[PDB]
Design an enzyme around this catalytic site. Structure first.
Site, PDB file in Angstrom:
ATOM      1  N   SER A  39      35.294  29.888  32.973  1.00  0.00           N
ATOM      2  CA  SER A  39      35.788  30.759  34.046  1.00  0.00           C
ATOM      3  C   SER A  39      36.246  32.172  33.718  1.00  0.00           C
ATOM      4  CB  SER A  39      36.932  30.100  34.823  1.00  0.00           C
ATOM      5  OG  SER A  39      36.413  29.183  35.767  1.00  0.00           O
ATOM      6  N   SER A 202      41.975  33.064  32.770  1.00  0.00           N
ATOM      7  CA  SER A 202      41.798  31.925  31.871  1.00  0.00           C
ATOM      8  C   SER A 202      40.518  31.115  32.167  1.00  0.00           C
ATOM      9  CB  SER A 202      43.000  31.040  31.976  1.00  0.00           C
ATOM     10  OG  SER A 202      43.051  30.527  33.291  1.00  0.00           O
TER      11      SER A 202
END
Length: 257
Positions: A39, A202
């Protein structure tokens, strides 16, 4: 604190690339080894879209149907059969890590091939986008799909966002999302000093404890950022990651600046 020592302590593999945009000083550790970016690529796709759409035009809408929905789309599931602005798409992807918002963003840019094309032009020959969400999360150490190296990914984030072509309004809109993101509070945000401002994205792939964080770090008294890329993984497919590793890697690396 040595990074070799940190790998032994957690039984993990660490990849680091940090660049002080003011001085140009760099810190590297396994910075040419490939890791699944998961991601954290959401930041790269949002930036690429913001290069071709002025702030004043983010109100433009796109239609969402049943066929667009992939797993883990907490915001986008409420939009089946509706229209959403591009502004709300970027917010859902960055703040809620919405998988459907990210695929739609990639479509708007033109597809995986236009993304890759843009990376080439920025001079990034390493980052290798192949699959959309959530297939890009299935990492195999035996495959280069959807992987990059801490150096290649970090130089791209510097070119696109810190020394890029974004307007003031677009750069600020994106960085504010990253500063107010509560998903990365256990990562880089947990290991740097209290006076430092951290704007991060993150990531966690499904396999091999792939746990990553990418950030723009503002030391108290410096308006230019330190770009920080931290990619980590373990040896077994089913290993669960420990977030303190990234908090500690960040405390350790910031000591060089």
């Amino acid at each position: 604190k040595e990074l070799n020592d940190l790998e032994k302590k957690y039984n993990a593999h660490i990849g680091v690339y940090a660049l002080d945009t003011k001085s140009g000083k760099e810190v590297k550790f396994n910075s040419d080894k490939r890791f699944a970016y998961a991601s954290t690529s959401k930041a790269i796709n949002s930036a690429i879209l913001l290069e071709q759409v002025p702030y004043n035009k983010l109100n433009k809408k796109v239609h969402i149907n049943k066929d667009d929905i992939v797993a883990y789309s907490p915001i986008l599931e409420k939009y089946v059969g509706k229209d959403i602005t591009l502004k709300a798409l970027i917010e859902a992807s960055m703040t809620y890590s919405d998988n459907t918002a990210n695929n739609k963003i990639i479509k708007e840019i033109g597809g995986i091939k236009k993304v890759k094309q843009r990376l080439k032009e920025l001079g990034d020959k390493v980052t290798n986008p192949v699959r959309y969400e959530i297939e890009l999360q299935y990492y195999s150490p035996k495959s280069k799909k959807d992987t990059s190296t801490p150096a290649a990914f970090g130089k791209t984030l510097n070119k696109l966002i810190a020394n890029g072509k974004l307007s003031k309004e677009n750069k600020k809109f994106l960085l504010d999302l990253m500063l107010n993101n509560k998903s990365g509070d256990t990562l880089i945000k947990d290991g740097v000093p209290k006076d430092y401002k951290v704007a991060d994205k993150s990531g966690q792939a499904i396999t091999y404890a792939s746990r990553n964080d990418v950030a723009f770090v503002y030391p108290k008294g410096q308006s230019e950022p330190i770009v920080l890329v931290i990619f980590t993984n373990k040896d077994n497919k089913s290993d669960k990651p420990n977030d303190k590793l990234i908090s500690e890697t960040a405390k350790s690396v910031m000591k060089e600046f």
